[PDB]
Amino acid sequence: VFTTVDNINLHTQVVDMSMTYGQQFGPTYLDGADVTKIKPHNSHEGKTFYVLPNDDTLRVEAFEYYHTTDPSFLGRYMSALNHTKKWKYPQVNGLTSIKWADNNCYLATALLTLQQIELKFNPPALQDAYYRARAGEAANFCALILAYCNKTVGELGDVRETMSYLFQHANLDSCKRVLNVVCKTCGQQQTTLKGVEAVMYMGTLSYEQFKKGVQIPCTCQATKYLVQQESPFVMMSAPPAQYELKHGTFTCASEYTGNYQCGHYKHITSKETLYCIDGALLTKSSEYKGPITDVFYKENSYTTTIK
Ligand SMILES: Cc1ccc(OCCN(C)C)cc1C(=O)N[C@H](C)c1cc(-c2cnn(C)c2)cc(-c2cnn(C3CC3)c2)c1
Ligand SMILES: [Cl-]
Ligand SMILES: [Cl-]
Ligand SMILES: [Cl-]
Ligand SMILES: [Zn+2]
Ligand SMILES: [Zn+2]
Ligand SMILES: [Zn+2]
Ligand SMILES: [Zn+2]
Ligand SMILES: [Zn+2]
Ligand SMILES: [Zn+2]
């Protein structure tokens, strides 16, 4: 049979039916199923298996593909995959979504959002599954998202927190945000965020209000406005509150209805008209009013007019 850690480079192996897979190769998986406590059967022979890194060759290959050295990672990825490959991934409005199952509402919103923002993942495993998710087979991608976020199937997820962990494994080095804070006593302070901090802001949903200026506390209340922003997109987050989404003013948004952590997530996207994707369900409207917590805007470069 074949054992591998990345499903790219296959290592050939010969097995004995008297000793279980766990005796010969350590923890072994087969399509998410755990064959560690299962003896070798005749149905599968010469097939590819997932094994934990036990030698340095596998340890290196495991980093080249996943960019992590945590031994628990492979197990968590394999256990999430066993759920995600049973999920259904319908095509809603040309985007790949997830039919509701196991509190995946936050996963569906993130998946729909990722198909609409420009993002390059550093781990080859993330990028390869990202591509195959856009094609309609997002099982391995959703499993990887869970493993990289230290979350399990069924656990409650925050879309803003999920996007953050994904952005830290994405190439956002070219992104830059220049801010200026104006306290009357203190004066003017210029800070320059880069990477994940250049893309996300918590406090307001309106990108315009961020450009105008947000009232922030200072070491002395001051005002923080956006000076220059170079990034393929920006994420504006805020606690869930009623908001009016206008057609053409944003890319996509996260609607959150319910109590803290217990609530359910919906995805609103701005196409030729406002669409609302709740798993496999699609509703159309010209205007939208509802409780929004994240809004994704498209950007390329920007420099403020006030100096
Ligand atoms: C689903 C889910 C899953 C997991 C989860 O984990 C949170 C804990 N993490 C550290 C692991 C949160 C959520 C969740 O409800 N998110 C929505 C978006 C949420 C809702 C509410 C809220 C308040 N009252 N009502 C009825 C609703 C408040 C905030 C919030 C306000 N301020 N902020 C941040 C600090 C600045 C976040 C966020
Ligand atoms: Cl890394
Ligand atoms: Cl990374
Ligand atoms: Cl609603
Ligand atoms: Zn090899
Ligand atoms: Zn990396
Ligand atoms: Zn399940
Ligand atoms: Zn399941
Ligand atoms: Zn001050
Ligand atoms: Zn839900």
From Swiss-Prot:
Annotated catalytic residues: 105, 264, 278
Start and end residues of each Peptidase C16 domain: 65-307
Outcome after substituting residue 86 to N: In strain: Beta/B.1.351
Outcome after substituting residue 63 to A: Partial loss of ISG15 cleavage in vitro
Subcellular location: Host endoplasmic reticulum membrane
Bilayer topology term: Multi-pass membrane protein
Activity regulation comment: Inhibited in vitro by GRL-0617.
Phenotype upon changing residue 60 to A: Partial loss of ISG15 cleavage in vitro
Record annotation: effect of changing residue 105 to A: Unable to remove host IFIH1 (MDA5) ISGylation
Catalytic activity line of the entry: Thiol-dependent hydrolysis of ester, thioester, amide, peptide and isopeptide bonds formed by the C-terminal Gly of ubiquitin (a 76-residue protein attached to proteins as an intracellular targeting signal)
Zinc finger (C4-type): 183-220
Recorded consequence of changing residue 260 to G/T: Reduced inhibition by GRL-0617
Domain Ubiquitin-like: 1-51
Binding site for Zn(2+) 4: 183, 186, 218, 220
Subunit text: May form homohexamers. Interacts with N protein.
Entry function: Responsible for the cleavages located at the N-terminus of the replicase polyprotein. Participates together with nsp4 in the assembly of virally-induced cytoplasmic double-membrane vesicles necessary for viral replication. Antagonizes innate immune induction of type I interferon by blocking the phosphorylation, dimerization and subsequent nuclear translocation of host IRF3. Also prevents host NF-kappa-B signaling. In addition, PL-PRO possesses a deubiquitinating/deISGylating activity and processes both 'Lys-48'- and 'Lys-63'-linked polyubiquitin chains from cellular substrates.
Protein name, UniProt field: Papain-like protease nsp3
Residue span relative to the full protein: 1570 to 1878 of 4405
